[PDB]
Design a protein around this ligand. Structure first.
Ligand code: FE
Length: 819
């Protein structure tokens, strides 16, 4: 009585960015664990230590880097049916275990194990590594002999809340954002703790445990590597797919190299004309040979530029200029990008006029808008008519930015206004900007559109100040806070409280791939003190703190797409429509395409949940699920735990809602705000990240310059040349799909569950996404929708096409927040 098995694994050398016979002998042991026969203590019986016997070269299903090994277990009639196994690696080097498959007389009796886990030397683990077969069980359905194993593995994953975490640990826990400052290096690099107070609320991040700095016991000391639990950093076969490593290289190597070129006056310090910026993707920028030779050897980085190996670095041409070099300058495109650009989810309907501020007048005085209704050209509408017909909209950054303008403007090389933009929905269905208000605290001018004269340059600059607001809000709030930061606590809670066996674990975990990893690298190099974001975006050392102020108002249930639209007053509830909302901007590309994706995910969740939960009772009674959600709210988002809007998770309908929102944030929402960054923002004049001066005052040389040289006046106002080179490089990385991405509708292994009904439902989901993609292609070819879906830049809105090939494609929805 012997069971034949096949082990598939990848040796360490295949998944690194920087011999098989050794696996034979007594170097790798496996022990099967019975699911049906228990020892005296009720635990599944354990078989004998069994070793890898030989290499299996005649296996066609092997992928790149994968090796298969034969094994033969002795398993007599007393042992029952296997359901789990132990593995002990006695080698000195870790390997990546993929799968164990046990053969049976019939092909239906095959038992499959999907592992996908790094296995380190047995002496490094407190308890032996255990893996379960791919059967799905809610806790009350677990075979009795596996219950204790299920419960103890979860205990292992939680740890005890103490200790410095090491590379091989698989311990998931929470901590505050106290690791961004670097006070032990310089007092000026001190940063506030974010999280754990009502003054600075914030989502938690993964605990690393390096301990305190010497100069501040509340700030965590720096480390060369920021830990994540080992299997959150899976590796890649090809180095060019390790995109997440790029920010570290940009900060530590590339940025110092660029800076030396500017210190040595080897290239002009400023752009002088728009052509100087267009040159970056045409002929390139010429840099010294020792700078080029430092950059081009680096993995990942070298893929960002074309070079001649001597003096030229050339950036790729951004989509937004691929047809028209100038269309970005039009009012039409400015407005269109608020519904179809990199940041499409901030605009709000106006139901009253003038707009009002909620700012404390004791501190900020009267903040009532100074825009008058009669100054606006609404194509012949009166204000009463345009309001009543819901044609007026705004991009309102006044109350968000005003509390920080004084502090920002005290920086030596930042100056900003808090802005409002008024939009009118024309009879042809496109948006028209009709006024911009530029405000300063104690101080407020209204700028109207103009096409001729010095007033047209002032209007151009006013649009730049608006997009500096918008770029900062996009990066820190729409992107970093709402997707990256908000999701990490749910990742942590899932691994701590839902068994790998659990149906909701299997539903959600594909939507977490690489999230903790990219976030930890971001804490180290992107959002740290003097990191990429602080040295490229307007608010400098205030950048992350500003996102904490916005998190005060973050509402989980308002992240659902229909709720968000209604809240922002860009849709109304309408049960006579497919999706239950009527779009007041009917053509709104992000929202109209997003609703299709939303509905597809909804159908998938509503078809998967009832396979495992028949009644509300089954949700209430699932102890893992209840512990998971309690911890996600009370610890992971614990600064908001008291808010009344958290779902209680006592019904089927709550479980669906929670899972749907999580999946939406991690896939389509992140994709829509992330993968258009270089396509729209690769031209720095279209998406400036910073402003450096206020408007010229009449009678000064800066004002005279504005009359005689509008391009120089514009370039002096926005992001300087050196930070432009950095910020372009980092948004080029972020806009790139790695070749090993897993997209919505895909999974990394087809045998993630043995439940044929769940597999069929998942197949239906993938088929529906292909049907939706064809629908969205038809929309982009529809001449009636050209005004908003293509615009004067002639750039089809493809950001919610579910599929994509590798590269910088402006399309494709990953499962997760992976970059
Ligand atoms: Fe991202």
């Amino acid at each position: 009585h012997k069971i034949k098995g096949t082990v598939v694994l990848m040796p360490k050398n295949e998944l690194e960015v920087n011999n098989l016979n050794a696996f034979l002998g007594r170097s790798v042991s496996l022990q099967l664990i019975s699911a049906t026969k228990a020892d005296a203590h009720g635990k599944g019986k354990v078989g004998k230590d069994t070793f890898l016997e030989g290499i299996n070269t005649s296996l066609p299903t092997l992928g790149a880097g994968e090796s298969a090994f034969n094994i033969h277990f002795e398993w007599d009639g007393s042992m029952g049916i296997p359901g789990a196994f132990y593995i002990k690696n006695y080698m000195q080097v870790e390997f990546f275990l993929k799968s164990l498959t046990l053969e049976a007389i019939s092909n239906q009796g095959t038992i499959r194990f999907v592992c996908n886990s790094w296995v380190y030397n047995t002496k490094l683990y407190k308890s032996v590594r255990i893996f379960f077969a791919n059967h799905t069980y809610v806790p009350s359905e677990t075979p009795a002999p596996l219950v204790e194993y299920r419960e103890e593995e979860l205990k292992s994953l939680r740890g005890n809340g103490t200790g410095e975490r090491k590379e091989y640990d698989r311990i998931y826990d929470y901590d505050v954002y106290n690791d961004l400052g670097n006070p032990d290096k310089s007092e000026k690099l001190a940063r506030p703790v974010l999280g754990g107070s009502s003054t600075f609320p914030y989502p938690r991040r993964g605990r690393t445990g390096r301990g305190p700095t010497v100069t501040d016991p509340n700030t965590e000391k720096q480390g060369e590597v920021f830990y994540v639990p080992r299997d959150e950093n899976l590796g890649h076969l090809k180095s060019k797919d390790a995109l997440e490593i790029g920010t570290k290289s940009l900060s530590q190597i590339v940025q110092p190299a660029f800076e030396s070129a500017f210190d040595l006056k080897s290239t002009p310090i400023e752009f002088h004309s728009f052509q100087d910026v267009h040159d970056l993707y045409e002929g390139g920028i010429k840099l010294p040979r020792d700078v080029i030779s430092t950059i081009i050897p680096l993995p990942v980085i070298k893929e960002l530029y074309r070079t001649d190996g001597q003096h030229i670095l050339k950036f790729p041409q951004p989509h937004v200029v691929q047809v028209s070099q100038s269309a970005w300058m039009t009012d039409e495109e400015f407005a269109r990008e608020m519904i179809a650009g990199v940041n499409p989810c901030v605009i709000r309907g106006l139901e009253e006029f003038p707009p009002k501020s909620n700012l404390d007048p004791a501190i900020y005085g009267d903040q009532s808008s100074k825009i008058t209704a009669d100054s606006l050209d609404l194509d012949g509408y009166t204000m009463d008519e345009a309001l009543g017909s819901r044609r007026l909209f705004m991009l309102d950054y006044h109350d968000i930015f005003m509390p920080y303008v004084r502090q920002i403007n005290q920086l030596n090389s930042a100056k900003t206004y808090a802005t409002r933009t008024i939009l009118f929905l024309r009879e042809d269905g496109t948006l028209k900007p009709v006024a911009i208000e530029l405000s300063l605290p104690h101080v407020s001018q209204v700028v109207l559109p103009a096409k001729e004269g010095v007033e047209s340059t002032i209007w151009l600059l006013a649009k730049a100040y608006v997009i500096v607001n918008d770029s900062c809000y996009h990066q820190l709030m729409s992107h970093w806070l709402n997707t990256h930061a908000a999701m990490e606590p749910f990742v942590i809670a899932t691994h701590r409280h839902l068994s790998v066996l659990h149906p909701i674990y299997k539903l959600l975990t594909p939507h977490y791939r690489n999230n903790m990893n990219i976030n930890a690298l971001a804490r180290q190099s992107a959002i740290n003190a003097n990191g990429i974001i602080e040295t490229t975006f307007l608010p400098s050392k205030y950048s992350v703190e500003m996102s904490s102020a916005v998190y005060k108002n973050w509402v989980f249930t308002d992240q659902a797409l229909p709720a968000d639209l209604i809240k922002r007053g860009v849709a109304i509830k309408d049960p006579s429509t497919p999706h239950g909302v009527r779009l007041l901007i009917e053509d709104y590309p992000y929202a109209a395409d997003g609703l299709e994706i939303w509905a597809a995910i909804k159908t998938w969740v509503q078809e998967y949940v009832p396979l495992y939960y028949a009644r509300d009772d089954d949700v209430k009674n699932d102890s893992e699920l209840q512990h998971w959600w309690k911890e996600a709210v009370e610890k992971g988002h614990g600064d908001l735990k008291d808010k009344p809007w958290w779902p209680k998770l006592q019904t089927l309908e709550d479980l669906v809602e929670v899972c749907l929102i999580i999946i939406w944030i991690a896939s389509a929402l992140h994709a829509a705000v992330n993968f258009g960054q270089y396509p729209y923002g690769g031209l720095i004049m279209n998406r400036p990240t910073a402003s450096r001066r206020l408007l010229p005052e009449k009678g000064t040389p800066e004002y005279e310059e504005m009359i005689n040289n509008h391009e120089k006046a514009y370039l002096r106002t926005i992001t300087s040349k050196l930070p432009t080179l950095i910020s372009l490089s980092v948004i080029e990385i972020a806009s790139t799909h790695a070749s090993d991405e897993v997209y919505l509708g895909q999974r990394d292994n087809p045998h993630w569950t043995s439940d044929s009904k769940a597999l069929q439902a998942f197949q239906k989901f993938g088929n529906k996404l292909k049907e939706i993609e064809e629908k969205l292609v038809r929309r982009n070819n529809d001449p009636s929708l050209q005004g908003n879906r293509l615009g004067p830049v002639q750039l089809p809105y493809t950001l919610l096409y579910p599929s994509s090939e590798e590269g910088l494609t402006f399309r494709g929805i990953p499962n997760s927040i992976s970059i």
